[PDB]
């Protein structure tokens, strides 16, 4: 099951980052590739697959790492990064 099918494609996710705040220390490409799209306020994003949302990004944050840290069971996460990556993150 996919929470948000209109956001399945990387291209559609990138579009939502049109008004991504430049003050935020994480680039839209990286968020889009990790399955996130912009909800439209501040720095809130959601995964099109698991629907997990993240906010308050900090300098050095890695979208895939945070994805695996907070939502280790996302099917998109597992499909893109592999179970070993997830387990490895969880093991920190």
């Amino acid at each position: 099951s996919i929470s948000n099918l209109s956001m399945q494609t990387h291209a559609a996710r990138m579009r939502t980052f049109m008004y991504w705040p430049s003050s935020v220390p994480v680039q839209p490409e990286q968020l889009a590739s990790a399955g996130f799209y912009y909800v439209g306020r501040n720095d809130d994003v959601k995964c099109f697959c698991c629907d997990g949302g993240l906010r308050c990004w900090e300098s050095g944050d890695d979208p895939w790492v945070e994805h695996a840290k907070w939502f280790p069971r996302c099917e998109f996460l597992i499909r893109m990064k592999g179970q070993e990556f997830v387990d490895e993150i969880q093991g920190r």
């Binding site: 809130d44 959601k46 997990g52 949302g53 993240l54 906010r55 308050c56 990004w57 900090e58 944050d61 945070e66 907070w70």
Partner: peptide
């Protein structure tokens, strides 16, 4: 980052 509370 942190989860958006639901």
């Amino acid at each position: 980052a942190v989860p958006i509370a639901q």
